[PDB]
Amino acid sequence: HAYGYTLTANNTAFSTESLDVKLALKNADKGYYSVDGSAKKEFANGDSVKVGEGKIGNSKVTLTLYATGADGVETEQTYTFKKTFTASKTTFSAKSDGHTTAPESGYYGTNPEMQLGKHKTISVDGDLSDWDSSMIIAQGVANDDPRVYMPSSMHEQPWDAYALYSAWDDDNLYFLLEMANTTYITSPEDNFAASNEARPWRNSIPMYLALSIDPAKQATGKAVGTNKDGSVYTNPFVWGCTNGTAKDGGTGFTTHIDTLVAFDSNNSNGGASIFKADTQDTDGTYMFNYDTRIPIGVTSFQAQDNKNGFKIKYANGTKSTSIFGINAPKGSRVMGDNLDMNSNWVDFFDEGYKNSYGYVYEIAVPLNTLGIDRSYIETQGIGAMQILTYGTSGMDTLPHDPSMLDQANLEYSYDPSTSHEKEDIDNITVPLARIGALLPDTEVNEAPFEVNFGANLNSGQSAGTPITLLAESYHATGDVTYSFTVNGETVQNSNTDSCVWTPSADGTYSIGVVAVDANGNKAESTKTFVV
Numbered sequence: 001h002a003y004g005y006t007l008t009a010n011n012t013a014f015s016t017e018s019l020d021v022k023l024a025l026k027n028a029d030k031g032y033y034s035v036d037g038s039a040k041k042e043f044a045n046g047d048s049v050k051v052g053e054g055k056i057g058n059s060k061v062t063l064t065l066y067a068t069g070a071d072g073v074e075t076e077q078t079y080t081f082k083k084t085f086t087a088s089k090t091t092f093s094a095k096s097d098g099h100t101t102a103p104e105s106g107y108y109g110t111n112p113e114m115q116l117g118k119h120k121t122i123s124v125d126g127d128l129s130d131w132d133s134s135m136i137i138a139q140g141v142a143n144d145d146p147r148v149y150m151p152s153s154m155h156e157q158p159w160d161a162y163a164l165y166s167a168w169d170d171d172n173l174y175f176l177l178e179m180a181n182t183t184y185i186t187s188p189e190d191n192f193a194a195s196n197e198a199r200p201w202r203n204s205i206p207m208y209l210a211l212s213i214d215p216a217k218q219a220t221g222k223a224v225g226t227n228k229d230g231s232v233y234t235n236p237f238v239w240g241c242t243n244g245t246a247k248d249g250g251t252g253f254t255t256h257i258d259t260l261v262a263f264d265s266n267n268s269n270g271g272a273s274i275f276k277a278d279t280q281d282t283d284g285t286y287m288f289n290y291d292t293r294i295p296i297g298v299t300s301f302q303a304q305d306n307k308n309g310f311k312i313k314y315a316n317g318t319k320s321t322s323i324f325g326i327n328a329p330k331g332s333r334v335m336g337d338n339l340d341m342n343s344n345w346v347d348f349f350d351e352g353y354k355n356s357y358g359y360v361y362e363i364a365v366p367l368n369t370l371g372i373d374r375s376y377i378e379t380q381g382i383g384a385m386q387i388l389t390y391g392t393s394g395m396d397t398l399p400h401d402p403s404m405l406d407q408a409n410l411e412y413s414y415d416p417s418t419s420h421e422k423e424d425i426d427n428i429t430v431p432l433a434r435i436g437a438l439l440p441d442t443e444v445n446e447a448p449f450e451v452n453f454g455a456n457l458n459s460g461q462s463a464g465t466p467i468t469l470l471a472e473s474y475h476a477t478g479d480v481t482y483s484f485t486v487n488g489e490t491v492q493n494s495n496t497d498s499c500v501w502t503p504s505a506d507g508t509y510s511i512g513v514v515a516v517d518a519n520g521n522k523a524e525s526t527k528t529f530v531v
């Protein structure tokens, strides 16, 4: 049995102009390959194919390898690869929120497409029909929680935030939190996390909504209270401290917040509270006050009777129809892969994800516990971030903050199989997600006009093959005129976004487009095509 093969994984997606695919042979001196139906071309062991070369992004490449054994049996193996294109997207930030790190982008987004939430009455009932994708104020990714960066921590329950949605009405501020669990796909041998034991309500784990009502106030996370005898004490964080120290860390804030909704994954924490940073420290920052906190905890776990009109309901389920994240086994992660387009990004729904794998929290915070009304939300706006923990320190946030992963691959002091992110000091520096209205000093970074350009067939087609040059416009103003070029010469200049090129002779060609929109903005792309 003779056959051609590649060590390159089948259905690899690549963001580069090409993927240098290594060809090998078993029990044959020679073989042949066909790329996008090209005329068969001889290959010896070690030869390579520039899969995707000359092609437009978001196209499939088919590679067929042909071998004949001594027996005369003819063998064919067909691989498929995906060349991907991702447009840049508009971002914005305001210096007045105290942020020192730009919002994370790529698969992450803060207020994507300027979504600031909607005026809508939500039912806190675990039914997701109240929500839709247009209400997302913070987009995260799946499988970027700290355990993924350890050699073998996939046995540990995930703390994997996916998306945060918001609404408001006359009475309440509403949130939907989606959490993902991709353990079933990436690491099924780690049964504990690929089971009902992954449910976030298995135990009482702190969760937070960090809010900015007055954008000028900076609360570092430090807390102040008085004992029964009136003596003043301080803690570096509202929660997780004993004798004025945080032995297992916590989450602090550079980005401006003044309100902290401290609740729990089980809704069994009777001490759940809305803290206000109402006391100025010597450094001009504000401290969360134990003495003025608004109780929002249950009287009885069984009754789920939260105080002061706070509502929370959790369930299995998924609202998003796509779950984007990196599909890789334990030991095949890279420092910062969550911010890198070269990573093995998938929609996990294409890899066997089920709605029932995910978890949802619906939340109502009464406006009268935040000292605001609907007019304030729609005129001034507020800022929000969701924080997940596994007891003390942050693990994942929406919007996502790089302090969640800066020590992800270091060992947990009590159990070195798991992540130091469970016990370290995090500090938030990215913008909060805006609700209702943008800060007045907002600067918009508009995504410039760009094109996705290339051939409908892989480089290496035969002379006389009709090749369709294709162009796609992103962030264009009005109608676009496409000037298609071969070897620097204009072959077509018109409104039409495709052009048939039939090369008569062999050679290396440059193919290009120059696109001009209705305001004279220019986008260009030049690629190589070999005949």
Ligand SMILES: OC[C@H]1O[C@H](O[C@H]2[C@H](O)[C@@H](O)[C@@H](O[C@H]3[C@H](O)[C@@H](O)[C@@H](O[C@H]4[C@H](O)[C@@H](O)[C@@H](O[C@H]5[C@H](O)[C@@H](O)[C@@H](O[C@H]6[C@H](O)[C@@H](O)[C@@H](O[C@H]7[C@H](O)[C@@H](O)[C@@H](O[C@H]8[C@H](O)[C@@H](O)[C@@H](O[C@H]9[C@H](O)[C@@H](O)[C@@H](O[C@H]%10[C@H](O)[C@@H](O)[C@@H](O[C@H]%11[C@H](O)[C@@H](O)[C@@H](O[C@H]%12[C@H](O)[C@@H](O)[C@@H](O)O[C@@H]%12CO)O[C@@H]%11CO)O[C@@H]%10CO)O[C@@H]9CO)O[C@@H]8CO)O[C@@H]7CO)O[C@@H]6CO)O[C@@H]5CO)O[C@@H]4CO)O[C@@H]3CO)O[C@@H]2CO)[C@H](O)[C@@H](O)[C@@H]1O
Binding pocket: 155, 156, 157, 192, 193, 204, 205, 206, 238, 239, 240, 241, 262, 269, 270, 271, 272, 273, 290, 391, 412, 414, 415, 418
């Ligand atoms: O508002 C106003 C207010 O404010 C404030 O207050 C507040 C505060 O502040 C806050 O904070 C809050 O609080 C709250 C909270 O939150 C809640 O939560 C609650 O709490 C509480 C509780 O409840 C109670 O209970 C208490 O606690 C305590 C206790 O009691 C005591 O005891 C202590 O503890 C301790 C302990 O004891 C010790 O032990 C420690 O621990 C530790 C340990 O040690 C370590 O280890 C760790 O662990 C951990 C880990 O890491 C993780 O991961 C986990 O685990 C798990 C896992 O994950 C899973 O997976 C499982 O596993 C399993 C698996 O899966 C399976 O598979 C198995 O395995 C096995 C296998 O199969 C076999 O095959 C083997 O293997 C082997 C092989 O064969 C070879 O070949 C090699 O390869 O190797 C391998 C390995 O070896 O074998 C294996 C085995 O080994 O199985 C397994 C099992 O075994 O599962 C697991 C388990 O689960 O988890 C763990 C655990 O965690 O770490 C740890 C930790 O660190 O230590 C501890 C600590 O110290 O202590 C504690 C503490 O204290 O208490 C608490 C507190 O309190 O509640 C609270 C209250 O409420 O909130 C508040 C309010 O309310 C202020 O203050 C005030 O004034 C105001 O008013």
Ligand SMILES: OC[C@H]1O[C@H](O[C@H]2[C@H](O)[C@@H](O)[C@@H](O[C@H]3[C@H](O)[C@@H](O)[C@@H](O[C@H]4[C@H](O)[C@@H](O)[C@@H](O[C@H]5[C@H](O)[C@@H](O)[C@@H](O[C@H]6[C@H](O)[C@@H](O)[C@@H](O[C@H]7[C@H](O)[C@@H](O)[C@@H](O[C@H]8[C@H](O)[C@@H](O)[C@@H](O[C@H]9[C@H](O)[C@@H](O)[C@@H](O)O[C@@H]9CO)O[C@@H]8CO)O[C@@H]7CO)O[C@@H]6CO)O[C@@H]5CO)O[C@@H]4CO)O[C@@H]3CO)O[C@@H]2CO)[C@H](O)[C@@H](O)[C@@H]1O
Binding pocket: 152, 153, 155, 189, 203, 204, 205, 206, 240, 248, 390, 391, 392, 415, 417
């Ligand atoms: O909020 C304020 C608060 O914050 C903080 O508290 C929080 C905690 O920090 C946080 O963890 C959380 O706690 C809750 C727990 O999450 C929750 O689970 C629950 O815990 C209960 C248990 O439910 C209860 O049963 C009991 O637990 C017992 C166990 O039953 C018992 O078995 C025993 O477990 C220990 C083991 O005996 C011991 O060996 C060891 O096991 C480790 C192992 O050493 C480690 O290496 C690892 O193993 C991995 C391996 O590394 C990995 O490679 C892989 O291996 C596979 C390979 O990959 C494959 O190739 C192939 O070879 O196969 C192998 C497998 O064969 O997978 C392995 C696992 O399969 O992991 C092992 C498991 O951990 O350690 C075990 C314990 O860790 O003993 C425990 C009791 O000690 O009791 C616990 C409670 O104590 O409830 C918790 C909350 O109550 O949330 C907290 C919030 O309060 C702060 O800490 C706190 O101070 C603050 O106040």
Ligand SMILES: [Ca+2]
Binding pocket: 140, 141, 142, 143, 144, 145, 159, 160, 161, 162, 396
């Ligand atoms: Ca996540």
Ligand SMILES: [Ca+2]
Binding pocket: 403, 404, 405, 406, 407, 421, 424, 425, 426
């Ligand atoms: Ca950290």
Ligand SMILES: [Ca+2]
Binding pocket: 393, 394, 395, 403, 404, 420, 421, 422, 423, 424, 425, 426
């Ligand atoms: Ca952390």
Ligand code: NA
Binding pocket: 122, 123, 124, 125, 126, 127, 128, 129, 130, 362
């Ligand atoms: Na609902």
